[model samples]
Target: LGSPEFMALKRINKELSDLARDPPAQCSAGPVGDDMFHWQATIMGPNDSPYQGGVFFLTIHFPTDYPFKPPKVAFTTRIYHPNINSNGSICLDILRSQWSPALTISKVLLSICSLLCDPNPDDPLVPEIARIYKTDRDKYNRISREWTQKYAM
Candidate 1:
């Protein structure tokens, strides 16, 4: 019988393969390591949003007990979005208590892409950016675009 780690690794590999075959329009994923525990992702900025024309990078680190414990993910590229900090830490619910065993890595990535389309100012990583996002979308978009161009390709 395969070790638990090996089984989990196989499961993740299958899930990733399925995602690649039918990927979300805004994002894609690929292995970052031979072990298949780390992955690199690229997310396209939402259209008509300030993040448009931008591409953001992220790293996903799956634990030994993945599916039981949510993966640790962080943006590798800088972004001015309210839910993401300058340090690339993301503020998303699924990554925390909201996570469920039923959720897959592809779903998480899609959720992150959707999060870009709609930010949650209610729980923000950057309060200042959240305030700006609430008060002035245009200005917020401008700053977001600036950051995107500067950091995210």
Candidate 2:
């Protein structure tokens, strides 16, 4: 009953409205410009986490098909997390094979926030960070806080 572009736009519009109405805690997102296909988002570090007091930026790109395909999301601001690499690539299941049509952008951001709160060192994008995270917890936290204060202030 609809073309790919047509359906995609419809779903995007719905997301836009929903995001505005009831945004997730400590996170915000919207289109970067007139291009709804590309968006920019921000996530405040979780209050009780080591990454606290930092503001992180991310970009989102929805494919030509919405709902059926998960949008590509990546960090634009560098973070000191095992699952997030130096290049801002994230290692998360939902952003890949675990994605489902029912998940909304709000939920995605929430997932990211939680990831910051509790990192998964077992599955990491940066092995060096992961090793430090597991082996030297104190040093890991110190460096993470330093980076947050230095770059993300």
Candidate 3:
């Protein structure tokens, strides 16, 4: 019922087609090196947020088990957020247990944009950042912006 090569390609095609029609304004994604299964994605920092003026990059590796499982996404760029680790792993529920085949790449990008606007500190991949987020938001945003400036172009 899953991981069939043909079915996987069809699913990926649908995703790419949708993106072409309505490119997610806050994000963009596409296959890299003609390899459909592996893609590069980017999210433009949202205005009215600390992440403004930054562009974050992420990798999307779709599994044959896609539709049955969420695509694996990882930050190729360094960022500072309660939900994101120094290693570039993110702590987003939709990318984990809450994932559903019904969700699309654009939707995930929407979530990421929201994450930048308001990080979820309750479940953090980076503890120190989360701690600062909980105690002092101003300082947290300051450092987050610095990291965005230093790393993400």
Candidate 4:
């Protein structure tokens, strides 16, 4: 590309085109505003988890140097999870220190879905929820389901 400013758009368009051709299961995403960098995503709560039967929404703000820089991803729908804070911030390494240009938005969504199925209690955004997840699985599941029902309809 001739310019650094539009390089990110070139990269994102390729990824978006690929995703549209072969959409991932359990998740969907698209631009929210006129900006291609600003996107809205939806993920169906994973089966066999407390989050099942719920639909979750998320927001993603892609940086100008995307593919190299990770997008700002947050839960738009309120979800009860150890890795996701009350503010919808995520506690995933890939979104932080472990980011790589090779990772696609589809992959990120899959990772989020996987997180719903299996939360990492050790690295938690919400410690109280993590404690409940680790110490009392049943109670954690109950509350998670309740929140899912109340919010992620």
Local distance difference test values of all predictions, in order: 0.86, 0.89, 0.86, 0.90
TM-score for candidate 4, residues paired by index:
0.95
| Candidate 2 TM-score versus the reference | 0.94
Which sections of candidate 1 miss by over 4 Å?
Answer: none
Best-performing candidate as measured by lDDT: 4
Candidate structures ordered by lDDT, highest first: 4, 2, 3, 1
TM-score of each: 0.94, 0.94, 0.93, 0.95
| lDDT value for model 4 | 0.90
Superposed Cα deviation of residue 104, candidate 1 (Å): 0.8
Superposed Cα RMSD, model 2: 1.5
Which 10-residue window in model 4 sums to the lowest lDDT? Answer: 1-10
The numbered model that scores best in TM-score is 4
lDDT of 1 by residue, 24-141 (tens): 8888987876758988889888896678888888998889987888989999888888898867788878899888888988888888888888999999889998999999988998
User: How well does candidate 1 score on lDDT at residue 78?
Assistant: 82
Tens digit per residue, CA lDDT, model 2, 21-72: 8988888899988898999999888887888899999999999988788899
Per-residue lDDT for 1-153 in model 3, tens only? 755577778888899999878976778899999988999999988887788899999999988877778888988889888898777788888899999989988788778888888888888888888899999999998998898899977
lDDT: which is higher, 1 or 4? Answer: 4
Clashes of each: 0, 0, 0, 0
